[PDB]
Amino acid sequence: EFLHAQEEVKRIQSIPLVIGQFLEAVDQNTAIVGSTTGSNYYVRILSTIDRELLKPNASVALHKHSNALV
Amino acid sequence: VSLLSESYNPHVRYGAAMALGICCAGTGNKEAINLLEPMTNDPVNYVRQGALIASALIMIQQTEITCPKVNQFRQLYSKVINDKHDDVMAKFGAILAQGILDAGGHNVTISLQSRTGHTHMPSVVGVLVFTQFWFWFPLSHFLSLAYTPTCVIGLNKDLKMPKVQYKSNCKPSTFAYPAPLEVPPEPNFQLLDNPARVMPAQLKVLTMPETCRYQPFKPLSIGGIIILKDT
Amino acid sequence: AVDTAEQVYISSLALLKMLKHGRAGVPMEVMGLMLGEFVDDYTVRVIDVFAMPQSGTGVSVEAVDPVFQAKMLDMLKQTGRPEMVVGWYHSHPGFGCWLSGVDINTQQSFEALSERAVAVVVDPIQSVKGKVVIDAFRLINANMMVLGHEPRQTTSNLGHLNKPSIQALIHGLNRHYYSITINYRKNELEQKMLLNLHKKSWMEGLTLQDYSEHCKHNESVVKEMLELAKNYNKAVEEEDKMTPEQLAIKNVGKQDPKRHLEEHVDVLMTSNIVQCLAAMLDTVVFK
Amino acid sequence: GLRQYYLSKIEELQLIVNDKSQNLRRLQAQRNELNAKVRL
Amino acid sequence: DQTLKMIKILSGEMAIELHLQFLIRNNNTDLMILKNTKDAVRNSVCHTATVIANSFMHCGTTSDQFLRDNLEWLARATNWAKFTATASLGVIHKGHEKEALQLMATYLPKDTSPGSAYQEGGGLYALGLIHANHGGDIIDYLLNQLKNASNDIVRHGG
Predict the structure, then answer these.
(1) Residue B206 carries which DSSP code?
(2) Does B87 touch chain C (CB under 8 A)?
(3) How far is D18 from chain A (nearest CA, A)?
(4) C282, E45, E63, E107: which has the highest count of C-beta atoms within 10 A?
C-alpha cells in the first residue's frame, strides 16, 4: 500500500510548472527558494526528492498557484 | 481494535469505532470511552459521526457515577449540533444520539445477553440491521428489537399487583435521574414500587423485603417479573 | 426530485476511449458522446463512448455537421445492439473539473430532451497512475438559486463522501451544478483478461545474462563501493559530535555513505543470486 | 501428588508468554512507525 | 390454570402490556431537547433526523404530543421523510394491539388517497414494528394486501 501512495503524490508534478532557485533551508523538510518573478518565498517541500541533490545553487520547480517546492 | 483506530484509510478507522460500539455497549467501559476520546477529532466526517453513535451506545442509563464522561459528553453533542459551520453528516450523529441516550425515559436499554448465558437473538438481528443506515435511512429503524427494559416487577396472582417496598444498601448516588434544567442527610433507604426501574449493576446493592407482608420465594437475582409469595 | 445518491455506473471499457481521445488532442478541449443504457430514477449506466469531428478555438470548441451523428448511430445499432445517448463529455486539459461558462451552455441544450444527460469531465494530465480525476456533474436550476432554496433533498448517507476541490468551488460548484459519486463495473469477463494479458513475458529469465560481462559488472560496482565504504570509514568517525539532528540538515549538499552503502548491497545481491540460480537449473534440465 | 505435577506445567507454560509478547511488543511498534509513515 | 398455562407462558402477552404498563407509568423525558434542536430548519437531513430521534426515545409509550405540536414542519420534507414519519408512528406504539389500526385510520391507503403514497405505504411498515415476534391476523392482514397493491412503494412497507 505504501508503494501505491508513493507514486500517487506526483500528481502535483503536472504541466503548468514554474521555475525558482534554491537558497537555503530552515530545518528538515522546509526550505527557502527564490522564484524568477523576483520575490522570494518560504516554502514547504515534497518528500520524495533526494535532499542530497540540493544547494550548489540549484534550479527547482515550483507549483503554479500554491508555489511550493516540486 | 485500539491498533486499528489509527489505520490509514478512514473506512477501517470507521468500523473500528462501531466495533467498540457493538461489544461493550452494555457496560460503561472505562477503556472503550478512553479510545473514542480522540476519535471525534478526525478530519473525516463519518468517523466523527460513528464515534458519536459508539459514544451513545456505551453509556445509556448511566448518570455520572459509572463513568464521569457522561455529562462530559452531554455537553459534547450540544457543542456540535449548535454550530453552523459543521457538516450535516457530522452533526447527524449528535441528533441521533439524543434519541439513543435518553431512550424511553431511561427505561429501556440494549441487551445482547441474558443472565442464563444465552443471547437475545432479536437484539442480535436488531443491532446488525442497525448497521446499514448508509444505504437506506429507515433500514436502521429496526432498533426497537434491541430495546429491552431494566425493571424488577412483583406479582402474586395471575393479575394482581402486590404492594412491596424494599430499600438499598450501598452508596445512594448511583440511583440518579437525568434532572432536566427547564430555563424559561442522604438516602440508601430508597423505597420502590412494583414497576421500579433499576440499573443491572444495582441488582446487588438493594435489600430483600424482610419486614413486608410479601416475601419472594425466588432468589432475587434477575429483573423482569417474578412471583412474590404473600406471607 | 433526486436523492443525492445517484451512483453512476460506467464501465471498464469506456474510460480508455475517454483518455485516449482526451490525451491525443490534449491541450485543446476535445469532447464526444456517451452512448449508454438507462436504468431507474436513481442510477444510470453508460456503456459506450464515441467522439465526432470538431472545430475549436482557444476558449471555445464546437462541433460540425449533424449527418455524422445519425449515420454513426445507425451503424452501431446494426452491429452489436442498439443503445441511447445518456449524455456527453468533454476534456479540460490540465485544469481540474468544473463547468465553465460555455461548458454549461451546451449542457443546457442537452438536458431538455432527457433531463438526465450526464456531464463528464476527464483530465488526462492530473491523472498520473492512480486517481484519474473524473467527477461527473449535472446542472441545478439557477431559478432555485434565486429562491435561496437548497435542492436535492439528501436521503442517503452516500453523497457527502468525496470532498470537492477549492478550485472547482471557485467555479460554479455549488451554485449551478452538483457532483456525483461514481464507481466502476468490474467483472471476470474483463478484469481477469487485462491482468493476465498485459505484463507477460516468455524467455526473460530462462536465459543467462552476458556471461563474460556479468562477472565484469560484479567489479563495476564493487570498485567504487570500496571508496564509498571509505566514506563509511569516515562519517561514523565524526560522531559523538554536534547533535545528529544537525547531521540531517547539514548533509544535504553531498551524498551520505550510509544510505548509499546499503543501496548497492541489494543490487550486488539480486544480480548474483538470480544469475547463479538460473544457471544451475540448465545443468539439470538440459541433459 | 497429582496437583503437585500441575504447578510444574502452569509455570513453564508462562515462559511462552513473556517472550512472544516481547516479540509482539517489538512487532506492534514496527507497524505504528510504518502507519505513521503512510498517513503523513 | 394449567389448561390456561400454555397461553400465559408461550404467548407471553403479560410481559408485553405490563412492559407497556411500565412505560405508561415511567416516562421521564423532555420537550425542550427537541426544542433545542428545533432551530436547524433548512432543506437538510434534519427533518428526518428529529423524527428518528423522538422515535428512539419514546419506544412503546404511545405519547404523541412531541409530534402533534405542529403539522407543517413535520410535513415540509417529502417523498421519504413521509415514508419515515408514518414509520416512526409504530415504534411509539410498539407492542400494543389496539392502537395500531385505529390511530392509523387516517393513514390507511384507501381513505384519503393523497399525492404521497409513501405516507400511506409506509404504514404497513409500522404494522410490522408493533407486532414483531407476534404473528396472527398481522401476518394475514399484511399477506392479503400484498396480493394486489401498487408498485414497490407500499410493497417496501408491506
Answers:
(1) B
(2) yes
(3) 32
(4) E45
CA distance E77 to chain C (A): 8
Tell me if B137 and E84 make a contact (CB, 8 A cut-off). yes
Count residue pairs from B and C with Cβ separation < 8 A. Answer: 20
Q: Which of B200, B224, B207 is nearest to B66 (CA)?
A: B200
Question: Which experiment gave this structure?
Answer: cryo-EM
CB contacts, 8 Å: C149 with chain E: 43
Residue C90 counted as an annotated binding residue = yes
B96 touches chain E (CB under 8 A): yes
Q: Whole-angstrom Cα distance, residue B21 to residue E57? A: 19
Nearest residue in C to B132, CA atom:
C157
Taking the Cβ of residue C174 and every Cβ of chain E, the question of whether any pair is shorter than 8 Å is answered with no
User: Is the distance from CB of A9 to CB of A48 less than 8 angstroms?
Assistant: yes
User: Is C103 labeled as ligand-binding?
Assistant: yes
Give the bridge partners for C63, in sequence order.
C54
Contact C155 E42 (CB under 8 A): no
Name the residue type at position C188: E
Burial C241-278 (b: 16+ CB within 10 A, else e): eeeeeeeeeeebeeebbeeeeeeeeeeeeebeeebeee
Give dist(CA B43, CA B33) in Å, integer: 20
In this complex, which of D28, D38, D39 lies closest to B3 when CB atoms are compared? D28
Give me the sign of the Cα torsion angle C100, C103, C106, C107: negative
d(CA E82, CA E117): 9
CB pairs under 8 A between C and E: 19
Burial of B86 (0-12, 13-18, 19+ CB in 10 A): middle
- Breaks following residues of chain C (C-to-N distance > 2.5 Å): none
CA distance D19 to chain B (A): 20
CB contact under 8 A, B135 and C158: yes
Does C255 lie at the interface with A, CB-CB under 8 angstroms?
Answer: yes
**Through-space distance between the first and last CA atoms of chain E, rounded to whole angstroms:** 38
Q: Find out whether C171 is annotated in a ligand binding site.
A: no
Q: Do residues A43 and A31 touch, judged by C-beta distance below 8 A?
A: yes
Helix/strand/coil for C35: strand
Q: From CA C47, how far away is CA A56, in angstroms rounded?
A: 55
Which of A27, A20, A21, A18 has its CA nearest to residue A55? Answer: A21
Q: Where are the alpha helices (H) located in chain B, listed in sequence order?
A: 10-23, 30-35, 45-57, 71-81, 88-101, 121-128
% helix, strand, coil for chain D, step of 5: 85, 0, 15
Nine cell digits for residue C189: 469477463
Discontinuities in chain A with C to N beyond 2.5 Å fall right after: none
Across B118-157, the runs of DSSP E, i.e. the strands, are 147-149, 151-153
Reference C11, options C190, C195, C184; nearest CA is C184
Residues of C in Cβ contact (< 8 Å) with E47: none
Query: Omega into C174 within 30° of 0, i.e. cis?
Result: yes
Q: Which residue out of E45, E151, E153 would a mutagenesis test of the C interface target, given it has the greatest number of C Cβ atoms within 10 Å?
A: E45
Residues E3 and C259: their CA atoms lie apart, in Å, by 88
User: What resolution in angstroms does the PDB record give?
Assistant: 3.2
Q: How close are the terminal C-alpha atoms of chain C, in Å?
A: 76
Contact (Cβ atoms closer than 8 angstroms) between residue E46 and residue B95: yes
Whole-number Å distance between alpha carbons of C6 and C180: 6
As a 3-state breakdown, chain C gives helix, strand, coil percent values, each rounded to 5, of 35, 15, 50
d(CA E73, CA E49): 13
Report d(CA C38, CA C115) in Å as an integer. Answer: 12
The neighbouring-strand residues paired with A33 are A22, A41
E-chain residues near B85 (CB < 8 A): none
Taking CB atoms and an 8 Å cutoff, what residues of chain C touch E78?
1, 153
